[PDB]
Enzyme design. Structure first.
Site, short mmCIF file in Angstrom:
data_model
loop_
_atom_site.label_atom_id
_atom_site.label_comp_id
_atom_site.label_asym_id
_atom_site.label_seq_id
_atom_site.Cartn_x
_atom_site.Cartn_y
_atom_site.Cartn_z
N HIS A 61 -25.22 -115.94 54.29
CA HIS A 61 -25.94 -116.05 53.01
C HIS A 61 -27.11 -117.05 53.04
O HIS A 61 -28.06 -116.96 52.23
CB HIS A 61 -24.98 -116.51 51.96
CG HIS A 61 -23.80 -115.61 51.83
ND1 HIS A 61 -22.52 -116.04 51.92
CD2 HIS A 61 -23.73 -114.32 51.47
CE1 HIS A 61 -21.67 -115.03 51.76
NE2 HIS A 61 -22.41 -113.99 51.36
N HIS A 91 -29.00 -126.66 52.41
CA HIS A 91 -29.41 -125.32 52.75
C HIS A 91 -30.67 -125.00 51.98
O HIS A 91 -31.12 -125.78 51.15
CB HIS A 91 -28.33 -124.31 52.41
CG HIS A 91 -28.00 -124.31 50.94
ND1 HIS A 91 -27.06 -125.13 50.37
CD2 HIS A 91 -28.58 -123.64 49.89
CE1 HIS A 91 -27.07 -124.94 49.05
NE2 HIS A 91 -27.99 -124.04 48.73
N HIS A 93 -32.97 -121.59 50.04
CA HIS A 93 -33.13 -120.25 49.53
C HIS A 93 -34.60 -119.88 49.74
O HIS A 93 -35.45 -120.70 49.47
CB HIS A 93 -32.76 -120.20 48.04
CG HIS A 93 -31.39 -120.69 47.71
ND1 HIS A 93 -30.30 -119.86 47.58
CD2 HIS A 93 -30.87 -121.96 47.58
CE1 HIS A 93 -29.22 -120.58 47.33
NE2 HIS A 93 -29.53 -121.85 47.30
N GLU A 103 -35.24 -120.56 43.48
CA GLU A 103 -34.23 -120.23 42.45
C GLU A 103 -34.69 -120.75 41.11
O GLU A 103 -34.91 -119.99 40.17
CB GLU A 103 -32.84 -120.76 42.88
CG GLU A 103 -32.37 -120.07 44.15
CD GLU A 103 -30.92 -119.98 44.22
OE1 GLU A 103 -30.30 -121.11 44.10
OE2 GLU A 103 -30.38 -118.93 44.51
N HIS A 116 -31.70 -127.23 48.80
CA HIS A 116 -30.57 -127.77 48.05
C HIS A 116 -29.81 -128.77 48.90
O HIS A 116 -29.21 -128.38 49.91
CB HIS A 116 -29.61 -126.65 47.61
CG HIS A 116 -30.21 -125.78 46.59
ND1 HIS A 116 -29.73 -124.52 46.24
CD2 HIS A 116 -31.31 -126.04 45.82
CE1 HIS A 116 -30.49 -124.05 45.31
NE2 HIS A 116 -31.44 -124.94 44.98
N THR A 195 -25.19 -121.63 42.47
CA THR A 195 -25.97 -120.42 42.33
C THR A 195 -25.52 -119.27 43.14
O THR A 195 -26.12 -118.19 43.15
CB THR A 195 -27.46 -120.64 42.53
OG1 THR A 195 -27.73 -120.72 43.94
CG2 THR A 195 -28.02 -121.78 41.72
N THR A 196 -24.42 -119.48 43.92
CA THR A 196 -23.73 -118.43 44.65
C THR A 196 -22.31 -118.36 44.16
O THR A 196 -21.77 -119.35 43.71
CB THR A 196 -23.74 -118.72 46.17
OG1 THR A 196 -23.08 -120.00 46.39
CG2 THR A 196 -25.08 -118.73 46.73
CO LIG Z 1 -28.21 -123.36 46.90
#
Ligand SMILES: [Co+2]
Length: 257
Positions: A61, A91, A93, A103, A116, A195-196
């Site tokens: 992911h 991590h 996005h 995001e 993040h 957010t996941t």
């Molecule tokens: Co995140």
């Protein structure tokens, strides 16, 4: 399982995780005109001098850079926070193109990516307990724009070859996350969620105003990663972002005038 496709992406998550339609979901659009300056907020304290990075993982992911969180070594405090939060991982996005990937958005602007830095509240003893609490996590969010290279990011970019596919990990010691921070610690803050999946409503978000610059070449290397495992059909790891969710009954506060 869940992912970012047509058949398994954000618009589907609510079936397995009904909290997806909850009251404090993330990310959100930051309306800069309606965020109010809060003179009671503190400067953020980001103390990363003793951080001990250990490993980088492709989890299917994103990729996570993992830290030793068995002692107060890299901690976030101050700002909107009460108490001390320990760095566990960071991590990103990112998008398929430079015009999307973040995001959070700022007056509907999408950045090319968003970093993040995830921290858990030491009062709850471990991560897994912390995510069950409304004040369990603090996530420092940093936007990425494409322009100049970020020298501090290059070590991350150059190990990505070795973790192309889901489930692969590589030793990643001695990485200094201070090299990923912008000059200014001015921020916006609001209560939200991971957010996941499982989308838990446990996060105090702290989103920095100042983006960092990375080069096209750096972000292009993110986009060479794979969602799939080794020997499976290649599906490029791009567009691993959840869009903005309803703000509902929340206020976004600004640390700066
Ligand atoms: Co995140």
């Amino acid at each position: 399982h869940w992912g970012y496709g047509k058949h398994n992406g954000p618009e589907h998550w609510h079936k397995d995780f009904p909290i997806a339609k909850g009251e404090r979901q993330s990310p959100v659009d930051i309306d800069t005109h309606t965020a109010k300056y809060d003179p009671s907020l503190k400067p953020l304290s980001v103390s990363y001098d003793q951080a001990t990075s250990l490993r980088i993982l492709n989890n299917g992911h994103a990729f996570n850079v993992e830290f030793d969180d068995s002692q107060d070594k890299a901690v976030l405090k101050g700002g909107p926070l009460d108490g001390t939060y320990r760095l566990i991982q960071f991590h990103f996005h990112w998008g398929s193109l430079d015009g999307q990937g973040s995001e959070h958005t700022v007056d509907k602007k999408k950045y090319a990516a968003e970093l993040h830095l995830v921290h858990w509240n030491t009062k709850y003893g471990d991560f897994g307990k912390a995510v069950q609490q409304p004040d369990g996590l603090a996530v420092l969010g940093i936007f990425l724009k494409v322009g100049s290279a970020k020298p501090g990011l290059q070590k991350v970019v150059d190990v990505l070859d070795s973790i192309k596919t889901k489930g692969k990990s590589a030793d990643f010691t001695n990485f200094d996350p201070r090299g990923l921070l912008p000059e200014s610690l001015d921020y916006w803050t609001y209560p939200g969620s991971l957010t996941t999946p499982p989308l838990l409503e446990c996060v105090t978000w702290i989103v920095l105003k100042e983006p960092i610059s990375v080069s096209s070449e750096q972000v292009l290397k993110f986009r060479k990663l794979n969602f799939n495992g080794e020997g499976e059909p290649e599906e490029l790891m791009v567009d691993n972002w959840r869009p903005a969710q309803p703000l509902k009954n929340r206020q976004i506060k600004a640390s700066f005038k």
